[PDB]
Design a protein around this ligand. Structure first.
Ligand SMILES: [Mg+2]
Length: 115
C-alpha cells in the first residue's frame, strides 16, 4: 500500500479517520492525493526531500515509515515554503506535494500523511 500525502476534496466531508484513508486509496485520481511509491521514497530520501519536511514536522528524519501524520495549516504553510524554495521545487513529485498543500490551504483541510 503506497505512501499517501493527501487532503479531502472540497465537497467531501468524511470524518471517520479509517474512512478518510479508504477515500484516499479510492481517489488516487484526485489532485488532492499524492501516491508515492517505494522507488520515489528512496529517490527522494537520498536527495533530502523527507529531511526538508522533517525540518518542520520533526518526523521522517530517516524517511517515511508505517504510520499516520496530520499536518495543520501552520505546518502546511511552513512545509510548502520549504519545498517552493528547495533545489527540486520544480520536480513533479515536489510540485504534486505542493499542490496538495495549496489546495488544503485554500479549502481549509488537514493534510494527512499515511503509510
Ligand atoms: Mg469548501
Amino acid at each position: 500500500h503506497n505512501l499517501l500525502i493527501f487532503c479531502l476534496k472540497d465537497n467531501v466531508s468524511i470524518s471517520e479517520y479509517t474512512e478518510m484513508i479508504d477515500w484516499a486509496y479510492k481517489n488516487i485520481q484526485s489532485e488532492t492525493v499524492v501516491e508515492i511509491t517505494e522507488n520515489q521514497i528512496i529517490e527522494y530520501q537520498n536527495r533530502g526531500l523527507w529531511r526538508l519536511v522533517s525540518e518542520i514536522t520533526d518526523n521522517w528524519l530517516f524517511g517515511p515509515s508505517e504510520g499516520d501524520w496530520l499536518i495543520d495549516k501552520e505546518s502546511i504553510l511552513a512545509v510548502k515554503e520549504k519545498l517552493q524554495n528547495s533545489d527540486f521545487s520544480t520536480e513533479p513529485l515536489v510540485k504534486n506535494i505542493i499542490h496538495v498543500l495549496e489546495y488544503a490551504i485554500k479549502n481549509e483541510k488537514t493534510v494527512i500523511f499515511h503509510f
